[PDB]
Design a binder for this molecule. Structure first.
Ligand SMILES: *C[C@@](*)(O)[C@H](CCCNC(N)=[NH2+])NC(=O)[C@@H]1CCCN1C(=O)[C@H](N)Cc1ccccc1
Ligand SMILES: *C[C@@](*)(O)[C@H](CCCNC(N)=[NH2+])NC(=O)[C@@H]1CCCN1C(=O)[C@H](N)Cc1ccccc1
Lengths: 232, 232
């Protein structure tokens, strides 16, 4: 997270830390007692861990629940070339224990676009600068959704890649506020509602006005696949 | 086809006429002795026919081969809302008999974009005016690929819908030349190479400069699915 601040410990109890390996992290949302929604580009191995109720990565906390993946369900329409449908459901070996510290983030009922100018938040343990590594504590930043047509601009992504109807852009006109490396999978919250999944930006330019972070929209199509994959 | 002309009978022997029902037709390409590639939005029923070696729809011709569908393989990533991946493979009950009149159109080796300004052709039995019904004989028109960024313009599709990296636009700056209703599925040929599949335009505005026809690009991703579905 670029230009955010350290969250009140455990004030975002749906946040999942994904320890992928030694060099890599990701985030995600707990969407059911045994389901984590994250991004498809986040590659797990057999040693990977899903950590619930975390604030600090390193510090030992009584609140933490270390979970294991039973099965990966990457979205079958994920296109690594367009970045389209960058979604993945992780089924856990056991159910999380819900409490004050570990909660379920609810899916939106309707898969609406988010209207430009809306204020949104994203939390994560990723880079806080375009250098170095992850943040030891969970941080959060507030961002504005940027009009899709501006996002596809010559002064923005400029069709490399195309920012389509199942993505939103969010940041600031002036820059300084963004997700970054290691925030992939993190839920985009907009006016209290789960709305997107952190996907990509410009390499080593988190927070550059040219490259507002791109979030996969929880649209009708993506919701259908989520609901189907869980229930049944 | 808008602003085209009647083809020399049987000079495009890979062309498939799809008789979907009484009110509807489509086109397609014969890509193997028992495989037709068309568009996913083209709905067949049990009475539907795939006609090979046709020139006229009505007239009885010794060249015609009336084929039947064993199984439909609509592209699993087809999105009816974005029009994305509008592709469908039809497996035939028997093999076509290849001759002078019925041939296989070869897939491109590399799934490249088509560069703006390239001249392309599309053939079909669809509307020749923004009214009335199909053409009794196969026609063909030549069109130019329109730059993707112009296609997404305020004076064009204007993000309703987005014209993405797995679509090309083709028509003319002045209008008058286009595919139309009933041409869906027809192969887009560019400098001798099979390049796209006729998908959509603006309703009752075939040939309007605002809405150049949109073709699904035979990109790497789509080729992989085609090859996989056939061989195995
Ligand atoms: C996997 C995630 O941790 C990470 C989050 C980065 C978010 N960045 C900003 N600025 N908010 N995502 C990625 O690293 C993704 C997946 C792999 C590629 N990628 C990118 O962000 C590339 N920079 C995307 C790209 C854009 C334009 C041209 C080439 C590549
Ligand atoms: C199914 C095909 O025969 C047909 C071909 C039309 C090609 N038109 C031009 N101008 N070259 N395609 C369609 O009818 C497709 C599938 C169903 C919807 N559709 C459309 O062409 C709509 N007009 C697409 C559309 C665009 C903008 C807004 C709403 C719908």
């Amino acid at each position: 997270i670029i230009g955010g601040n350290e969250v009140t410990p455990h004030s975002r109890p749906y946040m999942v830390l994904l320890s992928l390996d030694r060099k890599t992290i990701c985030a995600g949302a707990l969407i059911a007692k045994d389901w984590v929604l994250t991004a498809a580009h986040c590659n797990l191995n057999k040693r990977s861990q899903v950590i619930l109720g975390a604030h600090s990565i390193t510090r030992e906390e009584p609140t933490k629940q270390i979970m294991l993946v039973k099965k990966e369900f990457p979205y079958p329409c994920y296109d690594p070339a367009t970045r389209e449908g960058d979604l993945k459901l992780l089924q856990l070996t056991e159910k999380a224990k819900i409490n004050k510290y570990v909660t379920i983030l609810h899916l939106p009922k309707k898969g609406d676009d988010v209207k430009p100018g809306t204020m949104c938040q994203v939390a994560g343990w990723g880079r806080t600068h375009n250098s170095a590594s992850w943040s030891d504590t969970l941080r959060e930043v507030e961002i504005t959704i940027i009009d899709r047509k501006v996002c596809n601009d010559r002064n923005h992504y400029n069709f490399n890649p195309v920012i389509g109807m199942n993505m939103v852009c969010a940041g600031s006109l002036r820059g300084g506020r963004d997700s970054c490396n290691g925030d992939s999978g993190s839920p985009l919250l907009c006016e209290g509602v789960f709305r997107g999944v952190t996907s990509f930006g410009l390499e080593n330019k988190c927070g550059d006005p040219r490259g507002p972070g791109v979030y996969i929209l929880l649209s009708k199509k993506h919701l259908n696949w989520i609901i189907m994959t869980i229930k049944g």
